[PDB]
Write a protein that binds this ligand. Structure first.
Ligand code: I3P
Length: 259
C-alpha cells in the first residue's frame, strides 16, 4: 500500500496485535490497520516502520532463550515429522552436525533444528541473537548462524552503529523505556513470547527507534497465570528468557556507550 505494508495473514498475530493496540506496549509496536484480500491471499495490514527514515540502517534481533513453542516438543514425541527443509539449512552451516540417523533420512525435527540453532548462536548464552543487518551504504548481512561469543556479537553491533554515539545513546533510551513498559504490561505478563524480534532502525539525521515485531507465536497463558520472563526455561514452565535477553542487550549497549 502507501505508508502501509501487507503481511501474510496469521490468526495468532492478528489476535496479538488487536490486544497490543490497547496495551502500554502500543508505542513500541507497528500500528495495526486490519486485514485485506489481494491477488488471491489474505493479509494483515501494518504500519511501514521505515516510512519516516531517509536511507535507514536496520537490525533485527530474535529475542529469548527459547525459539520454539512447547507443543512442538511434546508433539515431536507423539507423532514425529522430520523435515528436508531443515536438514539442508543445517548441513549448509555444519555438515555432520546431523546424527548418523539424521544423515540417512535427509531430515531433522523442528525442535531439534531450532535447538541446534539456539546453541550455535548467542541465544542460549545471551538470550538474543542478531538475524539481519542492512547498512546506510547498501550492504547487508543475514549470515549470523555462528555468531555466538560475546565479542562476535559486540563487533557486529559496533559495525552497525558505525561509531555514532548519539545514535547508540538513543537506542539504549528506547530499550530502557521498552523495558519499563514490558514490566507493567498486562499483555506481556500474560503471554509466552517466542520467535519475536526487536527491529532497530536509524538515520543519518539522527532519528532512531526500536519496535517489537513478529507475533506469530505469542501465546496466551491460562487464567490469572503469569511469567517472569527471566527465570530459565524448563519443559512445563513456559518461561521465555525474553527479559533475560533484553537485560543482557541493554547491558551490552551501555557498555558500548562508555567507550
Ligand atoms: O532462521 P532459520 O534458521 O532459517 O529458521 C527459520 C526461523 O527460525 C523462523 O523464525 C521459523 O519460524 P517461527 O519462528 O515462526 O516458527 C522457521 O520455521 P518454519 O520453516 O517451520 O516456518 C525457521 O525455518
Amino acid at each position: 500500500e502507501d505508508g502501509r505494508i501487507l503481511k501474510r495473514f496469521c490468526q495468532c498475530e492478528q489476535r496479538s496485535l488487536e490486544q497490543l493496540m490497547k496495551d502500554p506496549l502500543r508505542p513500541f509496536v507497528p500500528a495495526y490497520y486490519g486485514m485485506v484480500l489481494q491477488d488471491g491471499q489474505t493479509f494483515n495490514q501494518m504500519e511501514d516502520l521505515l516510512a519516516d527514515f531517509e536511507g535507514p540502517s536496520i537490525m533485527d534481533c530474535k529475542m529469548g532463550s527459547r525459539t520454539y513453542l512447547e507443543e512442538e516438543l511434546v508433539k515431536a514425541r507423539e507423532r514425529p515429522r522430520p523435515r528436508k527443509d531443515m536438514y539442508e539449512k543445517m548441513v549448509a552451516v555444519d555438515p555432520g552436525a546431523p546424527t548418523p540417523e539424521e544423515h540417512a533420512q535427509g531430515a531433522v525435527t523442528k525442535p531439534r533444528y531450532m535447538q541446534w540453532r539456539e546453541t550455535m548462536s548467542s541465544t542460549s548464552t545471551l538470550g538474543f541473537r542478531i538475524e539481519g543487518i542492512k547498512k546506510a551504504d547498501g550492504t547487508c548481512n543475514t549470515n549470523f548462524k555462528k555468531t555466538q561469543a560475546l565479542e562476535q556479537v559486540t563487533k557486529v553491533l559496533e559495525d552497525f552503529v558505525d561509531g555514532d554515539h548519539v545514535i547508540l545513546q538513543k537506542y539504549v533510551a528506547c530499550l530502557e523505556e521498552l523495558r519499563e513498559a514490558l514490566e507493567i504490561s498486562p499483555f506481556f505478563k500474560t503471554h509466552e513470547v517466542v520467535g519475536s524480534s526487536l527491529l532497530f532502525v536509524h538515520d543519518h539525521t539522527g532519528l532512531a527507534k526500536v519496535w517489537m515485531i513478529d507475533f506469530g507465536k505469542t501465546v496466551a497463558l491460562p487464567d490469572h497465570q503469569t511469567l517472569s520472563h527471566r527465570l530459565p526455561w524448563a519443559e512445563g514452565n513456559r518461561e521465555d528468557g525474553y527479559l533475560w535477553g533484553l537485560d543482557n542487550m541493554i547491558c551490552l549497549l551501555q557498555g558500548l556507550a562508555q567507550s
